[PDB]
Amino acid sequence: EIYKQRCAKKGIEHDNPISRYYDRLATVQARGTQASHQVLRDILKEVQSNMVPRSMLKEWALHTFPNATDYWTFRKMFTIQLALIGFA
């Protein structure tokens, strides 16, 4: 929902990176070859550069928690809860 809000503000469709991934795979496969690990790396790098920057969640949090204490507390809680969730 955070990602979709960022996309709606930017005006881009949220399923665009998946379409780009499959389009790039079709383009490489049309050349009669399987996609290497490097092709997948290039696709992910392209998605990161163009459509989904690394800072979407951070910029959302900075807007959502302008108070420094609230931002710190939220981030710390998020970190520990994610630690437990990933462990599980």
Partner: protein
């Protein structure tokens, strides 16, 4: 319980998620991948049923009356 618009929307989203799972399974063969019988049956069920104890009986009666909507018929 949800109205028929929301039911059809939910089923479309579920089918899209299943299609994405199949697409990554068939990632080797994009532009040649075909739909599985499961997705075929899912879409057949969706088109056959397009969304549409006294409380449950009254809800069923309402749903029967809901099908008269011309906009729902055109959709």
């Amino acid at each position: 319980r949800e109205n028929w618009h929301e039911e059809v929307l939910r089923q479309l989203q579920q089918g899209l998620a299943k299609c994405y799972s199949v697409a990554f399974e068939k990632s080797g063969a994009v532009s040649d991948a075909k739909i599985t019988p499961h997705t075929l049956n899912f879409v057949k069920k969706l088109v056959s049923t397009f969304g549409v104890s006294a409380a449950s009986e009254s809800l069923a009666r309402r749903a029967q009356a809901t099908a008269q909507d011309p906009v729902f018929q055109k959709l």
